[PDB]
Amino acid sequence: RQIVVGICSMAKKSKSKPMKEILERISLFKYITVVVFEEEVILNEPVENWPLCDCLISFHSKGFPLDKAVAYAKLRNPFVINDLNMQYLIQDRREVYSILQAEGILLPRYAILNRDPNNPKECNLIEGEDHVEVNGEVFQKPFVEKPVSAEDHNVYIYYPTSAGGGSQRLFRKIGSRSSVYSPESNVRKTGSYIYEEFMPTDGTDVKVYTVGPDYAHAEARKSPALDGKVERDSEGKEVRYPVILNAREKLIAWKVCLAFKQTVCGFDLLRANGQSYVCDVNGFSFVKNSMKYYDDCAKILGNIVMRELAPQFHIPWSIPLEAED
Numbered sequence: 001r002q003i004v005v006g007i008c009s010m011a012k013k014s015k016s017k018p019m020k021e022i023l024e025r026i027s028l029f030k031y032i033t034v035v036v037f038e039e040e041v042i043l044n045e046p047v048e049n050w051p052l053c054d055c056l057i058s059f060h061s062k063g064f065p066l067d068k069a070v071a072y073a074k075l076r077n078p079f080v081i082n083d084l085n086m087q088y089l090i091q092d093r094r095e096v097y098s099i100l101q102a103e104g105i106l107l108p109r110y111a112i113l114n115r116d117p118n119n120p121k122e123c124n125l126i127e128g129e130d131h132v133e134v135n136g137e138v139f140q141k142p143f144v145e146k147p148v149s150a151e152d153h154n155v156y157i158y159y160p161t162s163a164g165g166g167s168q169r170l171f172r173k174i175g176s177r178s179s180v181y182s183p184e185s186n187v188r189k190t191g192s193y194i195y196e197e198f199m200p201t202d203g204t205d206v207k208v209y210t211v212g213p214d215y216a217h218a219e220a221r222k223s224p225a226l227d228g229k230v231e232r233d234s235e236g237k238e239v240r241y242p243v244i245l246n247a248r249e250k251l252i253a254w255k256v257c258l259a260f261k262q263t264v265c266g267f268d269l270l271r272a273n274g275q276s277y278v279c280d281v282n283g284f285s286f287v288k289n290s291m292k293y294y295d296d297c298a299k300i301l302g303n304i305v306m307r308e309l310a311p312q313f314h315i316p317w318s319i320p321l322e323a324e325d
């Protein structure tokens with residue numbers, strides 16, 4: 001019989017352009033059949049009624065019932081491409097940074113401010129005009145303040161008096177803007193945050209996309225920390241700049257992929273002071289608008305499936321050579 005690869009995510013993701021491009025290419029594998037789980041089934045049907053698969057590609061986004069995905073995998077024991085339990089941890093920036101540290105991955109110096117919503121003023125925070133003290137640890141402005149929830153994209157940067165003070169408030173892109181300046185110089189007074197040192201870059205962030213530990217595509221975009229106007233080309237797509245990862249960065253990608261057990265994994269790099277710092281790990285994420293990535297990603301994922309399962313299905317398989325870039 002055919003090896004069945006099941007795709008389990010919100011419809012917004014399962015029906016996206018990159019997903020469709022990749023799934024058509026995986027379907028080209030002679031012994032692989034692709035089954036996309038309907039969102040109505042995922043949300044409304046008990047896991048006992050979900051389609052069967054031999055390999056599961058499943059990932060959380062807003063609205064996704066991760067508890068059900070975990071129960072399904074426990075019930076059916078498929079080969080899992082992106083580990084489901086780690087997807088709880090990826091939602092919490094504190095857990096992300098903790099894992100990166102444990103792996104010896106360079107990251108910004110940071111401190112966690114845990115605030116009790118009932119006792120908001122009892123937290124370990126002291127504010128000056130040009131610095132904060134978080135659990136005793138000092139951060140001179142400029143510094144970055146991130147919500148502990150990785151799904152909350154309201155990241156603020158606080159400027160020193162020497163630069164005019166105030167703050168840059170970042171957010172999920174709304175049309176032509178990714179951030180705005182505010183005259184507010186004082187930090188947020190409700191919620192829990194990670195405070196971290198601001199790393200000076202050349203004005204771009206590097207986005208890295210892994211497909212297994214030995215392949216990573218990188219590209220750069222204008223930092224939303226700069227002025228907040230999104231750069232678009234003549235076709236209306238956000239401008240991306242070419243990146244080739246160095247040997248240190250290729251190792252970072254290998255480590256992130258393995259540490260979080262996410263075969264397909266997106267993360268952000270800051271090129272600063274002659275090193276590269278990870279500032280965010282997003283989990284399952286495809287490159288957009290690259291034909292070559294569609295080809296490479298589908299080939300790599302199909303090969304992973306065949307490598308793992310071809311012996312069980314008595315299918316002959318000799319492992320092929322793959323690009324790393």
Ligand SMILES: O=C(CP(=O)(O)O)O[C@@H]1[C@@H](OP(=O)(O)O)[C@H](OP(=O)(O)O)[C@H](OP(=O)(O)O)[C@H](OP(=O)(O)O)[C@H]1OP(=O)(O)O
Nearest residue numbers: 012013061062172173207238266267282283284285286288
């Ligand atoms: O903002 C946009 C609109 P686009 O820029 O015109 O495409 O697209 C973003 C998606 O928002 P929505 O598509 O509107 O839901 C967002 O999904 P979410 O987190 O569920 O909100 C992520 O997509 P993914 O799930 O990781 O693949 C972002 O990629 P990231 O995680 O590396 O930051 C996308 O940003 P990039 O496309 O500019 O790289």
Ligand SMILES: Nc1ncnc2c1ncn2[C@@H]1O[C@H](COP(=O)(O)OP(=O)(O)NP(=O)(O)O)[C@@H](O)[C@H]1O
Nearest residue numbers: 108144153155196197198199205223224268279280
């Ligand atoms: N320590 C830092 N130093 C300098 N710039 C930073 C730092 N942390 C974050 N940034 C910038 O702020 C942006 C948003 O921060 P990030 O930690 O990626 O938040 P996010 O809400 O998880 N974004 P994403 O998940 O990629 O949509 C990054 O792309 C960087 O440009």
Ligand SMILES: [Mg+2]
Nearest residue numbers: 027029030032
């Ligand atoms: Mg096929």
Ligand SMILES: [Mg+2]
Nearest residue numbers: 060061282283
């Ligand atoms: Mg995501």
Ligand SMILES: [Mg+2]
Nearest residue numbers: 268279280281
């Ligand atoms: Mg990011």
Ligand SMILES: [Mg+2]
Nearest residue numbers: 150280281282
């Ligand atoms: Mg993120």
